[PDB]
Subunit: 33 residues, 3 copies
């Protein structure tokens, strides 16, 4: 059960992480547009 | 070895998200040249 | 104990990866200014 809990918690964190940084990049694009 | 293998599969996953984000940053960078 | 260790190693890499990308993004923000 726990290893399956782990797999779930990681894919999710990785998704937020990816998006958290992509936003920093999106603001830069809008700015220097 | 089963959990170790799991570590390597997730590690492979982060290096890819890392590189995938860097490319979006490299695109803008290439434009800013 | 092997699951706990795998978490530590995964959280560390995710933490580093994030900042290593933000540091690259900051270099680009400097090229713009
Ligand atoms: Cl650090
Ligand atoms: Cl640091
Ligand atoms: Cl660092
Ligand atoms: Cl820093
Ligand atoms: Ni530090
Ligand atoms: Ni830093
Ligand atoms: Ni550092």
């Amino acid at each position: 059960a726990e290893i399956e809990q782990i797999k779930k918690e990681i894919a999710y964190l990785i998704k937020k992480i990816k998006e958290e940084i992509l936003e920093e990049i999106k603001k830069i694009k809008q700015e220097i547009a």
